[PDB]
Scaffold this active site. Structure first.
Site, PDB file in Angstrom:
ATOM      1  N   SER A 225       4.401   2.063   7.921  1.00  0.00           N
ATOM      2  CA  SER A 225       4.324   0.867   6.987  1.00  0.00           C
ATOM      3  C   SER A 225       5.507   0.593   6.309  1.00  0.00           C
ATOM      4  O   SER A 225       6.277   1.556   5.876  1.00  0.00           O
ATOM      5  CB  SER A 225       3.124   1.190   5.687  1.00  0.00           C
ATOM      6  OG  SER A 225       1.714   1.355   6.712  1.00  0.00           O
TER       7      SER A 225
ATOM      8  N   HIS B 229       0.893  -1.270   0.003  1.00  0.00           N
ATOM      9  CA  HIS B 229       0.236  -0.005   0.111  1.00  0.00           C
ATOM     10  C   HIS B 229       0.908   1.101   0.036  1.00  0.00           C
ATOM     11  O   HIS B 229       0.428   2.494  -0.244  1.00  0.00           O
ATOM     12  CB  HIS B 229      -1.127   0.030   1.135  1.00  0.00           C
ATOM     13  CG  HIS B 229      -0.358   0.500   2.667  1.00  0.00           C
ATOM     14  ND1 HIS B 229       0.043  -0.546   3.668  1.00  0.00           N
ATOM     15  CD2 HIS B 229      -0.111   1.358   2.819  1.00  0.00           C
ATOM     16  CE1 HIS B 229       0.418   0.127   4.378  1.00  0.00           C
ATOM     17  NE2 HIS B 229       0.492   1.432   4.204  1.00  0.00           N
TER      18      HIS B 229
ATOM     19  N   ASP C 161      -0.182  -7.577   2.021  1.00  0.00           N
ATOM     20  CA  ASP C 161       0.396  -6.254   2.015  1.00  0.00           C
ATOM     21  C   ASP C 161       1.891  -6.050   1.775  1.00  0.00           C
ATOM     22  O   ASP C 161       2.515  -6.094   2.663  1.00  0.00           O
ATOM     23  CB  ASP C 161       0.028  -5.392   3.076  1.00  0.00           C
ATOM     24  CG  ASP C 161      -0.013  -3.751   2.851  1.00  0.00           C
ATOM     25  OD1 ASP C 161       0.428  -3.367   1.810  1.00  0.00           O
ATOM     26  OD2 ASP C 161      -0.150  -3.059   3.842  1.00  0.00           O
TER      27      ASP C 161
END
Ligand code: NA
Lengths: 249, 26
Positions: A197, A43, A99
């Site tokens: 992230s 992402h 992810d």
């Protein structure tokens, strides 16, 4: 990283920073798994609900950095990206299942006291270490509270039992994720947060004293809320894809 | 090669919080 502390120099030499090229803006963390391969979250690269679809030329990485305040001569290295590979079953529509993304560097990076790859887990290591109550470590330059630090942050956090992860949230969790954090009952706190992230959740093997990357910071709901937990992509579960990409390119 | 840090494992030195992790294995 919420409730962490400053990393010591060389404490996380597999740390990678994922930047927008122009203007230079820090977007995500990442991790060094060989001299030319870097792991991150999908992402950070591809997210259609936000019209995000970064290509190789949009981005760069910095490796071997400790502080954002100063240039570290002959220590920090920049690399451009040759190619981005997103998991082909990455589910951006629902829950960020799978992810994970790999980025191949245009120029291999030289290893050093500050630059060195983390290991990916074999089966036994995964089965042995990825258990409730065992602690791993999460690192990032992302938000300190639900702004951003000058030195890399680190926090140690316990893996949580899958039923507890599942009951903590309405988002549909999958076997390709795990969750970590302290429970309200345990006193201590800490979490990854927006901007972290792609950064690694690592664990130190008691069998061979090597550091293994077990997870990738992937998602959450707020940061460091009581009864909530960060969610990580489960690296081992996706390792055949990682190996195919690296072996097949 | 992988997962052994030049400034720590390769020099038989412990970082300030790794003992917390290894203790959690008990
Ligand atoms: Na929490």
């Amino acid at each position: 990283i919420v409730e962490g502390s400053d990393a010591e120099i060389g404490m996380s030499p597999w740390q990678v920073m994922l930047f927008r090229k122009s203007p230079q803006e820090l977007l995500c963390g990442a991790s060094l798994i060989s001299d030319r391969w870097v792991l991150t979250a999908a992402h950070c690269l591809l997210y259609p609900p936000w019209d995000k679809n970064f290509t190789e030329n949009d981005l760069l990485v910095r490796i071997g950095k400790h502080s954002r305040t100063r240039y570290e001569r002959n220590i920090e290295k920049i690399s451009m990206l040759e190619k981005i590979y997103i998991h082909p079953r990455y589910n951006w529509r629902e829950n960020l299942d799978r992810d994970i993304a790999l980025m191949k560097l245009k120029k291999p990076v030289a290893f050093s006291d500050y630059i060195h790859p983390v290991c990916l887990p074999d089966r036994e290591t995964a089965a042995s270490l990825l258990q409730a109550g065992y602690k791993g470590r999460v690192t990032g330059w992302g938000n300190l509270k639900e702004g951003q630090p000058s030195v890399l942050q680190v926090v140690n956090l316990p893996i949580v039992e899958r039923p507890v992860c599942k009951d903590s949230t309405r988002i549909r969790i999958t076997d390709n994720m795990f969750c970590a954090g302290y429970k309200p009952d345990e006193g201590k706190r800490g979490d990854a947060c927006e901007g972290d992230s792609g950064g690694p959740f690592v664990m130190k093997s008691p069998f061979n004293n090597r550091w293994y990357q077990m997870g990738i910071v992937s998602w959450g709901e707020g940061c460091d809320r009581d009864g909530k937990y960060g969610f990580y992509t489960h690296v081992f579960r996706l390792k055949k894809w990682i190996q195919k990409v690296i072996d097949q390119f | 090669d992988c997962g052994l840090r030049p400034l720590f494992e390769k020099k038989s030195l412990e970082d300030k919080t790794e003992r917390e992790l290894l203790e959690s294995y008990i």
